[PDB]
Design a protein around this nucleic acid. Sequence first.
DNA 1: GCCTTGCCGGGTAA
DNA 2: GTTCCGGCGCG
DNA 3: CGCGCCGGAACTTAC
DNA 4: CCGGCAAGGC
Length: 177
Amino acid sequence: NVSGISAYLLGLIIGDGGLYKLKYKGNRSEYRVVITQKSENLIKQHIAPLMQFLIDELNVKSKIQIVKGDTRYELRVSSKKLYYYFANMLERIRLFNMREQIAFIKGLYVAEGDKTLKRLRIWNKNKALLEIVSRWLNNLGVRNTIHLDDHRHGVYVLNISLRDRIKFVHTILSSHL
DNA sequence: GCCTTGCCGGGTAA
DNA sequence: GTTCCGGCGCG
DNA sequence: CGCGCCGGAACTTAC
DNA sequence: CCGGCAAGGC
Ligand SMILES: [Mg+2]
Ligand SMILES: [Mg+2]
């Protein structure tokens, strides 16, 4: 498990990618698991091998696609099976065990946390998602608050109290999944 | 004096 | 980040 | 006919 | 995501 790696990738996916169920002309379809990032190196050399491992583990026969956009690389797996694997794991997020919580927060922070680490913050439109992470962090002894940060785009922020900086960086960021 | 954290605008990296 | 497109594969 | 993998790329905006 | 500012508190 693999549960760990999966939770981390789901963090990357929810933060910086998506799960897409497409309908085409006609009546064609497609199911996509997507993580996007700017660094060619981070996608190719740390994110992709983790995904590959998960593909082998689950006998997914779809290939890992890396598609180049002008402002970002997109890692893409076209797979009904991989799609529902993450989609179902998402709808079960409230039931994550601790190994899974830690992996997922770390994934989510790689995706859209404050990376200056001068402050410790996670941004998201999804307040309910932050409220879930907030509770996980409290139970791990990392105090935090949530506010509507950006009124222009509806983006909430989860602010991790710098008082628990050491506990956060060592329990979440430097955790070994 | 200094740390912390809400507020809020610019613009890259989704 | 999300959703078109034209292509192909396959029962 | 109906549906699912590939390879984009154009289009939109949430961090 | 970044980061300057200002106000609260030790
Ligand atoms: Mg996001
Ligand atoms: Mg990111």
